[model samples]
Every structure is written in C-alpha cells, then in structure tokens.
Target chain A: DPFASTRTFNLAMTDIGEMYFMPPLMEALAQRAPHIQISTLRPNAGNLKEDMESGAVDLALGLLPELQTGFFQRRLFRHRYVCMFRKDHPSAKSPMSLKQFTELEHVGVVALNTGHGEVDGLLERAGIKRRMRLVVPHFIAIGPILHSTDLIATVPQRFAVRCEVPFGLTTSPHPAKLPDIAINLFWHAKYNRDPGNMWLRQLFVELFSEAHH
Target chain B: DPFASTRTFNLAMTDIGEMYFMPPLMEALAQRAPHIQISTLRPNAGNLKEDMESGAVDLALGLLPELQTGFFQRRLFRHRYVCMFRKDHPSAKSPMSLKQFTELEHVGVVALNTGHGEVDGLLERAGIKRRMRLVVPHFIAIGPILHSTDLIATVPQRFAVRCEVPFGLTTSPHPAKLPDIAINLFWHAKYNRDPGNMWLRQLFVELFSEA
Candidate 1:
C-alpha cells in the first residue's frame, strides 16, 4: 500500500502552457503513475511566487521573461512565431510583407504589469510600431479573435497551426525578425529530490521530448 | 490613535469587479479610513474560499455561480448585456437579427469549469446553440479580443462601453432575450460583526447603491 497514500501534486501554468503542454503530460502521468493526483492552476508570476514560497505548488511551466531565480529550470521547447487571421481576411490571400504586417491593425497579448511582450520588443527594435487595436492577457483568446476579425495576431506557430481549423483561422509566416518563445519547466530546489515531484518532472520531460523527436 | 493599528484588507474579485468598482472604492477608502491598507487579488472562488477560511481575504466581488453557501451577500449592480465587435465588422452596420447573431462566429468567457455560461443557457432555451468559436477565462480580455476580431461577444454593457474606444469596439443591443448580469458582494458570516469588515461593507453599499 506504499502508493495508496494518493499524494496530490499542484502545478502552476499560464493558459498557453495549460493548452499546449498539460494534456499529453496528464495522459502520460495517468498511465505511468496512477496514484498521484494532479491539480492545475492558472497563475501569473506573483501567484507562482507565492505558491512556490508556501510549497503549495509542486511544479510550473512558464516563460523565461517572468520566471524568478532560485528554481531548478529545464527548457521544454522553442516556439516560433506566425501571423494568424481569418481565411477571408484581406491579408490571408498571400504572405504578408513587413509593411503590410505593420499597416494592418494588430492584436497583442500583454503580460500583467508589462505593456507588451517579446513580439512587441522585436517590432520596436525594427522601428516598426504596429497599430495595436487590442491587447488580451493570453494566446488562447487570439484564435477566435483572429478568426472573426481583420486584425492580425503574431502568435506561436504551434498555437496558430493547432487552432487553425477550430477557429477558422489561417496562418502565414511572420515577416519580422523575432525571438522564439522559450518555454521551460521549473521546480523549487526544495523538491528536487522529492519522489512525487521527481516523477512528475520526469513525466513532463519524457512527454515533451517525444514531441521534439 | 484608535485607527493607528493598520491592517491590510485583502479584497478578491474577478476582472469586471476590479475595473468598475475598485477605483471609486479605493478613493473613498483613502480619505475615510486612512489607516486601512487594501490589497486586491484576482482569484477564483476556490482560492478565495481558502483565503477566507484562513482570514487572509475579507471580501469578494463575484458571480453567484461560484460562491459557496454560509456567506453574507449584497447586490452591487445588475449589469445589462450588449453585443460587442470591431467597428469595421460586417455586423456593426446595424442591429443584428437573431439569425445573423447566431450564425456569426462567437467568443465567450467561461467560468471555472464549463465552456457554456448564462448566455449559452439562454440560447439553448430558444433552441439555438451559438457557434462558440473560442472561450476565455475573463472579461478583461474580451475587449481586446472583440476589438481585433470578427467574433462577437455578449458582455456587460458597462464594460463594453468603458472599453469601446480603447479597444476600437462597437456595441449593439443583445439580440436574444436574456437576463441582466447580477453582480454581488460576498463575505463570510464570520466577519459580519467585525468593525473593519463592517466599515468596508458600508463603503460598498454606499458606493454601489446607485448602480
């Protein structure tokens, strides 16, 4: 009855992480370790910081821009950016040029307490200031928003490709130079050797590594 | 010196409550109760419940669906719904017919569990199920999402108006028959008689009584 205790493992992630990463890991964990109960929380850095300090969260999947020091980190994947819009959209007929991209109204995803993200930063460096028509907090919303409107969004290619048919969106290659999204798995050093935490971490590594392969 | 022992009152609410209610209340609290420090948290009910049990959160502004029993309640406002979309959107030309409304792509805000909401239930009763293209967790994001996309959202009228220009959105009357959003203030009974909590409740009643 060693595994009968049924310990709960709490995970903190943003919506992107939840959408792209959690499903496969959850399925893999269910078969590999059925005794471990998993709970997922949608958390910002402040929430993650609080949960980490209290030891309430066992693991986190997040972006490099927001993560803090003092945690063991491992990269999950690098995500490239792509432009998404509705199929009948004016720009959807052909690959957009940089001028066409910036001239069109844009929708951006802003992080809490931060105005814009790495995408905006890249645009700024190129002296291209897009006319940002709207700003949401996460990428999950961009799918439908793009499908039903003329506003174009630059999002992770994986997200764009995955949601294309469901949201009736079409994807085009991003025209500007930008950094790839660095997604990572993080855990407090306190749980580095903890049995349940180690198992969960390994499950993620295995599931995600298969994605890369 | 009676109010010298300053305590932080943690108020938890969803984005709608935070955007609409917090500004006026914060201003009023500053002058009326200078010694109190207010900490705002955007938390779901489970998080709020945990905080309330541990005395970490004093009050919450939330929907009735998620709130648990054994809590004191006050009606903050009854919010009306409106249809929102980009100004250039095809549907923005006129008040949409129900068929046009239902046929167009739709985006919705989901609560803790379900994909559908009060809007969905209202649609279902009429034998109509919207083409729900996307679902997000909050109303704050709806402004931007609707502003940039062709999808339409049925959102609180006040929120729709407030974010209209900033998000380049236009609002139309909701085409379907639906009830207004009844937003309420909730607090655990344990703090009913607590002096500071009472003062905070009075502030909400006074500030929101007009709504």
Candidate 2:
C-alpha cells in the first residue's frame, strides 16, 4: 500500500502555517506513517492554481482568497487581528485608544504577494498612517523584534498566541475595526475523490478541525 | 543634507537579517538619524543587480555572491554553518559523526535562487544526502520550528545564537567541513563616493566591525 511505501505529500502554506500547523501534523504522521515525506511549498500566486489543478500540490492552507471558482475549500478556523507587544509594554497596562495606536511606533509586516498584507492595508485605507520604524517583507522576526524593543504589531491573533509564552509577549484587542481573517484549507475540485488527496486532506481535518489549536 | 531631510535606506537581505542585524541597526538609526527610514527587502537575484545599479536599493547585506566585479563590497564578518536543534533533542547531548548526521532527519531552508541555498548544495556535492522532513522556501520560521519538534536544522552559526536564549535551542559544530560564508555590504560602484552611501557604510562598520 502507499502508506507502507515512500510517498511525498506537498502542501502550500505561509511561514505562519509552518508554526501553527506543522508540529501537530508532523507528530501525527510520525506516529502513523513513518515513510510519508512532507514537502511544504510557499503559496505562489503565479503558480498555485495551476499546481493545485494539476495535483502537483496536494493542499493549500491559510487565508487564500486567490483560490476560488473551481476550487473546493473548508474553513479551518477564524481569528481577529491583535496588537502584539511585550508584556512590559507601556500600553499593556490598559486599553489603548486609536490615537495611542497611531502615536505608538510599529514594526509593520509588509507581506507582499500574500493576503496577510491586508492587516496593514486595512489600516492605511482607513487613513490611519502609523509611524512604522521598520518594515520587513514577511512575518519572520516579529516575535523577537517586539520582545527586546517597545515596537508593537497588528497580526493574526494566533501569531501572538504562538509567541505569547516563547517570546514573553502578550496581545490586546486591535484598536481599529479590522476584518477577522478566516484561515481555510483549499484543493482543486478534480482531487475531490483521489485516494491520496482524500487521505491527506482527512488527516488535516482530523488534526485541525474544531479540535485543533 | 540627506540626513537632515527625511530619507529612506532600502536594503536587500534574507529573513535571517531580521533576527541578526535589524535590532541594532534600528536602534542606531533611531539614535543618530531619527527621520531616516529603514526598508528591508528580500534579496532577489532576478532584480537586485538592476535595482542596485539604478540606485532603487541603497545597500545589500548577506552572502550576496550575485553582486560582483562592478560592485563595491565591504566585509562585515565571516561565519560558518552549524547544526541547530532543540536543547532537548535526543541527539543534543553529544557530538555527531558524519554517519550519524546522514541518518538523522533535517528541516532544510530551501532558499531558492539565493546564495544561502549553497548550504544544502555543498552537502549534496559531498555525496551526503539528508532526509529533510520539511522544506520551506525562506528561513522565516527556523527558530520556532526547531523549538517544538525533535527536528534538526543546518543553518548559519548566528541563527542558533539568536535562538539560543530565546528559543532555548542549542548548536554543535558541523561534522562536515562546510565553506565559511562571508557576509558583505554591497553597493553599486556608480555611487561609491556618494555622501549618503559613505555615511551608511561607515555606520555598519562602526557598529559591526572589529574595533
């Protein structure tokens, strides 16, 4: 059977997915299928639809608004934006006003080519131009950057949840009304019944449905 | 002067730069040049040369082998590779032999098109094939990834240093002899003596250079 032999399962996800979903998924696989290899590919707007349609990629995760029309998707969970800052941050003592959010320095995540950019986009569209001291291309180092400095972030609530204990950081409700992000699992309709695709997708649902972190 | 007026300094570096350099660089700019904005862009071989040539990008940091000959570069420092694993990783208690290294699993940083990919290339050239369980495009989440799982990583020495205290991870010398990566500050020679370029390069050397 494929489970007994070497099999490769490819997934498209953001770096955030690597932190949120990988640990549990890896553990589940290691316990059940020792031979199945996992390949996590970055979700590329140019190639993802084509790859998913061709079945080269087995699944796509996160808030993938680009995967639509001919694709089948399921909601994994939903999260709102939060202001992530160190526990010792000045504003951590009380709720921050929209004016305070505008005045405080921020470390912006300019996640180009991904839907995550909407976090900053929604703010700018509302005419709330923050004083961002630093802007990086992706969500790589926010946890550490916010830890040793007074800078704060507006990111997915789970990002702060993941960093809360490890980086000694905490989160508060976003000052502005930003849309809640719905993270979902997407696959091409053609793979609705393919045995391999079905098996992998089920594994994800089992681990991450109403039951997962 | 550009320092007096609001100006931006755009740099091309990998995600690793965020953890290694930005903290100090941001602090330095805040102290010396309050209005100076910092924009850290990912180093892309496809556009870096032209961007640097046209001056859209001010400087580049990391092992940027792609910028050469016509470019001016300064040595920031040199570093070697190491094995990054959780402090509790089963293998963390001792040194690893090449044979033991071959048998273990890896979480590879498949940095396509960037010079950092050479880390894995060098290993394969030596006929050592590592079984990487998870291969991500960039080095974005290596710190957290190595923290929760028993997975191991082969990354630059400083990456482990950054995560050592924060993520509670540990490192060991690479069993195989890998080439040392020389991270240099690169700029197009067209603006070699431009006052702004000189000031910024001096800032980097002053903060990072050996006294």
Go through the candidates in order and give each one's DockQ: 0.04, 0.68
Give the per-residue Cα lDDT of candidate 1 at B194: 84
Evaluated on chain A only, model 1 obtains a TM-score of 0.88
| Candidate 1, superposed: residue stretches over 4 Å from native | A1-5, A45-47, A113-116, A210-213, B1-211
Per-residue lDDT of candidate 1, residues B1-211 (tens digit): 3256366677776556655665565456446654555556555434776676567888877565556466788887776888888889875545777888878867666554211256667778888777664555566656655655577878888778876765678888888888767777888878888888888788888988655
Error of 2 at A49 (Å): 2.2
Looking at candidate 2 chain A, the ten consecutive residues that score lowest on lDDT are A89-98
Tell me how far the alpha carbon of residue A67 in candidate 2 is from the true structure, in angstroms, after superposition: 1.6
Model 2 clash pairs are none
Candidate 2's C-alpha runs over 4 A off are A90-94, A211-213
- Sorted into a CAPRI-style docking class, model 2 comes out as medium
Tens digits of lDDT, candidate 2, A8-48: 88889877888888888878878877678887877763488
In Å, residue B139's CA in model 1 sits off its true spot by 11
What tens digits encode model 1's per-residue C-alpha lDDT throughout A75-138?
A: 8787788888888886554477888887786767755522126668778889988766345455
What are the fnat scores of the candidates, in the order listed?
0.00, 0.66
